[PDB]
Write a protein that binds this ligand. Structure first.
Ligand SMILES: Cc1cn([C@H]2C[C@H](O)[C@@H](CO[P-](=O)(=O)O[C@H]3C[C@H](n4cnc5c(N)[n+](C)cnc54)O[C@@H]3CO[P-](=O)(=O)O)O2)c(=O)[nH]c1=O
Ligand SMILES: O=C(O)CCC(=O)C(=O)O
Ligand SMILES: [Fe+3]
Length: 201
């Protein structure tokens, strides 16, 4: 029950093996790292980016940068497999004009979590975010526009795609501590890809 959200279960199941290979290729150029929040805390989720712009912490805040601050080189180009999956998902959900220029890649080891937050660094909050889940299952939690709104929970499994549009694009959301387990393609972790329109164009 999330206004504006389109859940496409197992939409990415047939693409997962290529997606994971391309994650590894991206990570060999811009490695996974645990960023430090403006509050001074080290995140348990490891992240990297591909595309023209990448989400990062920097100067005690959040922003999109064309340079990876850990490598001092541009983020790797967005793989074609990523772009094609995102476009197919966005078109199926009713957002044919969506043109992402950034993809944040999250890696969750057992016990890793992501506390409640909103995604508000993008210039046009009318553009959706496309989320792709790979590997171990996670409990996704989301509330509302206010931090105190009631929480709902949704299990996200390998291959699930969610297009967060309309009101749901602005919900507070997070991930609960990942349960340990085995997945044949990721072994012991979960990956999440979130495609964003980050450029002011
Ligand atoms: C309070 C406490 C914590 N910890 C540990 C435990 C915790 O996991 C770790 C920090 O990791 P995090 O889960 O809180 O990550 C934060 C950053 C993340 N976030 C925000 N904006 C975005 C965004 N646009 N995108 C794309 C992605 N992620 C985003 O959401 C979180 C809240 O953000 P903000 O605080 O509101 O700035 O610190 C302690 O040990 N002791 C303590 O007392
Ligand atoms: O892992 C997920 O499914 C959500 C990730 C997320 O909300 C973010 O990185 O902004
Ligand atoms: Fe988020």
């Amino acid at each position: 029950l999330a206004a504006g959200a389109v859940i496409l279960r197992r939409f990415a199941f047939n693409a997962a093996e290529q997606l994971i290979r391309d994650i590894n290729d991206v990570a060999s150029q811009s490695p996974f790292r645990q960023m430090v929040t403006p509050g001074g805390y080290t995140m348990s989720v490891a992240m990297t980016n591909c595309g023209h712009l990448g989400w990062t912490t920097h100067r005690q805040g959040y922003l999109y940068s064309p340079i990876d601050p850990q490598t001092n080189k541009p983020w790797p180009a967005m793989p074609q497999s990523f772009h094609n999956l995102c476009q197919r998902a966005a078109t199926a959900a009713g957002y044919p004009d969506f043109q992402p220029d950034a993809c944040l890649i999250n890696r969750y080891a057992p016990g890793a979590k992501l506390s409640l937050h909103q995604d508000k660094d993008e210039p046009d909050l009318r553009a959706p975010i496309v989320s792709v889940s790979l590997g171990l299952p996670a409990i996704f939690q989301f509330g509302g526009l206010k931090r105190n709104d009631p929480l709902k929970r949704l299990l996200l499994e390998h291959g699930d795609v969610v297009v967060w549009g309309g009101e749901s694009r602005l919900f507070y959301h997070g991930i609960q501590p990942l349960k340990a387990g085995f997945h044949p393609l990721t072994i012991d972790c979960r990956y999440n890809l979130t495609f964003r329109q980050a450029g002011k164009k």
